[PDB]
Amino acid sequence: KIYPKLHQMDMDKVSRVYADLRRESISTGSFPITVRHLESILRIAESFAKMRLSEFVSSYDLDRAIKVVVDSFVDAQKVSVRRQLRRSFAIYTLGH
Amino acid sequence: FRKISRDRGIIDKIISSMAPSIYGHRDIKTAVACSLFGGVPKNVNGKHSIRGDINVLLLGDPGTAKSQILKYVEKTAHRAVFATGQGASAVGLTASVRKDPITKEWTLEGGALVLADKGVCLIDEFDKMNDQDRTSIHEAMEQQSISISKAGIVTTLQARCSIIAAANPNGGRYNSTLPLAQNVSLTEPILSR
Amino acid sequence: SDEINELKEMVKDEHIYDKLVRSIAPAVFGHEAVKKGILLQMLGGVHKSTVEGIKLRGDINICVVGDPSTSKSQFLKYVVGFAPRSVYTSGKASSAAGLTAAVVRDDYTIEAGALMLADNGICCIDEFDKMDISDQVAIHEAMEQQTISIAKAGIHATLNARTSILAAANPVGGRYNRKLSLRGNLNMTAPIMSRFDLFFVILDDCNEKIDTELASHIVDLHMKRDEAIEPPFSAEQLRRYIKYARTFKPILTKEARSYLVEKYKELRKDDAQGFSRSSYRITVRQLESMIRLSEAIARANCVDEITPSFIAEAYDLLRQSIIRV
Amino acid sequence: RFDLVYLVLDKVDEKNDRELAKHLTNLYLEDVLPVEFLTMYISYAKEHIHPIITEAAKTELVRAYVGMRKMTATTRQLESMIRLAEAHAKMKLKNVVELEDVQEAVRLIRSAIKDKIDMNLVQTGKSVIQRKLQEDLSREIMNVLKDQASDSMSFNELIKQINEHSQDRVESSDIQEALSRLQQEDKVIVLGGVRRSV
DNA sequence: AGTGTGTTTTTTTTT
DNA sequence: CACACACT
Numbered sequence: 001k002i003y004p005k006l007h008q009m010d011m012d013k014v015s016r017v018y019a020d021l022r023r024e025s026i027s028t029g030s031f032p033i034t035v036r037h038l039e040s041i042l043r044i045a046e047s048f049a050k051m052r053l054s055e056f057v058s059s060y061d062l063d064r065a066i067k068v069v070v071d072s073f074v075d076a077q078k079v080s081v082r083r084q085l086r087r088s089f090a091i092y093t094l095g096h
Numbered sequence: 097f098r099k100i101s102r103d104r105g106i107i108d109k110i111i112s113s114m115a116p117s118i119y120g121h122r123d124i125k126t127a128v129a130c131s132l133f134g135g136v137p138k139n140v141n142g143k144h145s146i147r148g149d150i151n152v153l154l155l156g157d158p159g160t161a162k163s164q165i166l167k168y169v170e171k172t173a174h175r176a177v178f179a180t181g182q183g184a185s186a187v188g189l190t191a192s193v194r195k196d197p198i199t200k201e202w203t204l205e206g207g208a209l210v211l212a213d214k215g216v217c218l219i220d221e222f223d224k225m226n227d228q229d230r231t232s233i234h235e236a237m238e239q240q241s242i243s244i245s246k247a248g249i250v251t252t253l254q255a256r257c258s259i260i261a262a263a264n265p266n267g268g269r270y271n272s273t274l275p276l277a278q279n280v281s282l283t284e285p286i287l288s289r
Numbered sequence: 290s291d292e293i294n295e296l297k298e299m300v301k302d303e304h305i306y307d308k309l310v311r312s313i314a315p316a317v318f319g320h321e322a323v324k325k326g327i328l329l330q331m332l333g334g335v336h337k338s339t340v341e342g343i344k345l346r347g348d349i350n351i352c353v354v355g356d357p358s359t360s361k362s363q364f365l366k367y368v369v370g371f372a373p374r375s376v377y378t379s380g381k382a383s384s385a386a387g388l389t390a391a392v393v394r395d396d397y398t399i400e401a402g403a404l405m406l407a408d409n410g411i412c413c414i415d416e417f418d419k420m421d422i423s424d425q426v427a428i429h430e431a432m433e434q435q436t437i438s439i440a441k442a443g444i445h446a447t448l449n450a451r452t453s454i455l456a457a458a459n460p461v462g463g464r465y466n467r468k469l470s471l472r473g474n475l476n477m478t479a480p481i482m483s484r485f486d487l488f489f490v491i492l493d494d495c496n497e498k499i500d501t502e503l504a505s506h507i508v509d510l511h512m513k514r515d516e517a518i519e520p521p522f523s524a525e526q527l528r529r530y531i532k533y534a535r536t537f538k539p540i541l542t543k544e545a546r547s548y549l550v551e552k553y554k555e556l557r558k559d560d561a562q563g564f565s566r567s568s569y570r571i572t573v574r575q576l577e578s579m580i581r582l583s584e585a586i587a588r589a590n591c592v593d594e595i596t597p598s599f600i601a602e603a604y605d606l607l608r609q610s611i612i613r614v
Numbered sequence: 615r616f617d618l619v620y621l622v623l624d625k626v627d628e629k630n631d632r633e634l635a636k637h638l639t640n641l642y643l644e645d646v647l648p649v650e651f652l653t654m655y656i657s658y659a660k661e662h663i664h665p666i667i668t669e670a671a672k673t674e675l676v677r678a679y680v681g682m683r684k685m686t687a688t689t690r691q692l693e694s695m696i697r698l699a700e701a702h703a704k705m706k707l708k709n710v711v712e713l714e715d716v717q718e719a720v721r722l723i724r725s726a727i728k729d730k731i732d733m734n735l736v737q738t739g740k741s742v743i744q745r746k747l748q749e750d751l752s753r754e755i756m757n758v759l760k761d762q763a764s765d766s767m768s769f770n771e772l773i774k775q776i777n778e779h780s781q782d783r784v785e786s787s788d789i790q791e792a793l794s795r796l797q798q799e800d801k802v803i804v805l806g807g808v809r810r811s812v
Numbered sequence: 813a814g815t816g817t818g819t820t821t822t823t824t825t826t827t
Numbered sequence: 828c829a830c831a832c833a834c835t
């Protein structure tokens with residue numbers, strides 16, 4: 001019965017997210033970031049909203065989805081760059 | 097469910113809810129639970145489509161309950177399947193055709209990924225199993241459907257299944273200083289998808 | 290009645306442990322550590338069903354890795370020719386039919402598996418370095434969570450894999466390589482040994498001293514004499530108190546619980562040169578190993594509760610399976 | 615675990631070549647030992663005789679086994695000693711294992727041994743070189759780490775350095791197996807390709 | 813005497 | 828289609 005919908009969304013938040021995603025794959029400990037990764041983030045937002053059980057996606061639940069995906073990405077990195085990347089994404093992490 | 101939904105902190109309780117018998121692993125619990133919930137399927141212009149299922153890639157040290165995590169996952173999402181990984185192959189999991197001597201023609205054999213379709217897909221021992229089979233799985237998952245044209249059978253089967261791969265790090269221990277791709281004995285494209 | 294009296298006298302006696310060990314097997318190998326491992330695997334542990342879906346295996350996963358020349362081969366022959374419904378695998382050849390899961394047409398059938406013939410009996414396989422990985426994977430899933438199934442087409446019946454397991458592997462070159470240690474002397478993979486709780490290690494040496502006593506022992510053990518009999522317990526009686534030991538199973542007490550958790554911490558210290566004092570070799574799988582080992586210790590006593598003595602003895606078994614490098 | 619290993623070598627001396635070739639000539643030209651009686655005789659010897667070991671022959675077995683441990687020795691070789699002694703007791707239908715039975719068992723086995731014992735390619739002298747091989751590989755690893763940055767580096771270059779100075783031309787499969795073995799003890803970490811240090 | 817009923821290994825193809 | 832059997 002539950003089918004949350006992205007009726008409201010944060011376009012530019014995701015935009016800056018994918019921007020930061022860029023110029024990081026240059027790191028030897030960093031795997032490439034592609035469009036399907038962004039679609040992955042979107043579907044993670046959908047999964048979170050379904051988990052919230054509301055028929056409408058919540059912006060902040062989507063924010064937690066962003067947080068989870070970016071944290072997974074950071075964990076995927078080499079620990080040397082991982083600290084620099086976590087500081088860089090800290091501007092995103094606090095919003096969760 | 098509605099009453100708990102309006103209750104706040106439900107998300108954290110669900111995170112604690114998934115595989116309670118595995119102490120810790122808060123992020124892992126979050127990931128597997130949200131995979132169980134799964135994304136919303138999206139389709140564009142009828143033909144263009146976006147999967148509503150989540151492919152979880154897991155790297156785990158040996159003895160880290162990965163198989164048991166999968167076992168808790170199943171029986172919770174109703175429709176479920178288990179992929180031994182090494183046991184299945186390209187033909188066995190995705191789509192299989194069986195020659196049927198009793199009927200005297202080639203017949204479809206149940207692809208375990210077709211069994212995965214409509215439900216959650218468990219995947220285990222995948223980092224150790226066959227690479228050509230891995231490419232077959234890539235192909236099948238890319239379209240959320242398996243297309244097979246052999247032995248006179250040109251059928252194509254929808255494969256809507258949230259999959260969760262289980263993997264062991266190179267030597268069983270991930271090195272954080274080591275790049276993930278070097279910590280991974282598998283292909284780059286699979287981690288991308 | 291005489292059976293009950295034999296049970297009473299043997300449970301009441303002090304050295305109930307290692308008395309059966311001398312009774313068990315030809316005991317031609319004087320170490321007797323392999324034989325007490327055989328004893329514990331006889332007693333093993335009952336499968337555990339948690340409140341969640343994670344039903345914990347009760348059968349301890351043991352290796353008795355040793356040389357084919359050494360007495361382990363004869364010990365396995367003793368076990369298969371004696372222990373009820375036990376499966377013998379030579380090791381040099383592996384046929385999927387003999388393994389746990391196999392496919393036989395006509396309608397459709399399933400070939401008899403080792404564990405079905407085992408009937409919770411130990412996997413008495415030998416030379417695990419010599420069984421093929423294609424046949425090893427049959428037991429990988431089988432010894433994981435006691436689950437036999439086939440990913441291929443067919444009925445793929447869920448054969449009940451609740452069984453004790455004994456690799457009894459023989460390392461590269463047959464003989465032990467002190468350089469290669471307990472781990473890595475062999476093809477058998479890390480995940481499958483990760484399931485394997487304890488190994489009791491392998492040691493092979495010229496052993497000039499043993500050439501005096503145990504070299505003399507072999508002839509008397511095997512020859513016109515062949516009369517070195519050491520059965521402190523009869524075979525029939527042996528099965529009888531095996532049954533009686535299986536009747537009652539110890540459970541951890543609160544003092545025993547604290548004692549065992551502290552002793553697991555000591556194990557963790559013992560696993561130094563790693564993070565967290567890593568469980569690693571003695572993993573959570575091996576935490577289950579200690580629990581079932583404490584159950585099996587004085588299982589012949591049929592004590593209904595686990596005692597710290599059992600935990601300490603299991604710790605000793607761990608150590609004898611650890612320090613060797 | 616053979617009872618009595620023999621060695622057949624086609625290394626013939628010039629005079630021995632002359633003698634064997636003359637034996638052939640005799641064979642060529644035609645182109646007391648009953649021979650046939652041996653088959654029925656041995657069948658009846660099997661049906662009649664059941665060899666029994668004597669305590670004196672038992673002690674013969676004792677000190678033969680302990681010496682063969684000293685001069686290492688196999689339990690299967692001991693059971694072979696028993697079989698050879700019983701077979702000698704079978705010869706001449708003496709029905710009883712004798713001391714000289716065990717002594718000829720020993721002499722035949724040792725004569726095969728000289729070809730210490732080197733059974734199953736096991737010599738007490740220079741028994742194992744795996745210590746030196748592992749230490750050489752590890753020393754080459756430290757040399758590479760000093761020469762090349764990072765603990766992990768490509769396997770092809772490792773194959774390059776190992777051959778030039780550290781050791782002879784050897785495949786990297788052995789090094790990878792050794793690294794996996796060390797990882798199984800977690801004293802080192804294994805990769806795959808590349809060799810990372812702990 | 814009714815009336816019924818029966819006879820013409822190989823070789824690719826997977827994999 | 829049409830000819831040897833087994834009773835019809």
Ligand SMILES: Nc1ncnc2c1ncn2[C@@H]1O[C@H](COP(=O)(O)OP(=O)(O)O)[C@@H](O)[C@H]1O
Pocket residue numbers: 117118119120121156157158159160161162163164165343433480483573574
């Ligand atoms: N955090 C945890 N809490 C409880 N059990 C755990 C935890 N981590 C690992 N385990 C145990 O580890 C065991 C091994 O799980 P499995 O997935 O089969 O291991 P492997 O890592 O070899 O694939 C399971 O029986 C599970 O209960």
Ligand SMILES: [Mg+2]
Pocket residue numbers: 161162163164220
């Ligand atoms: Mg697992």
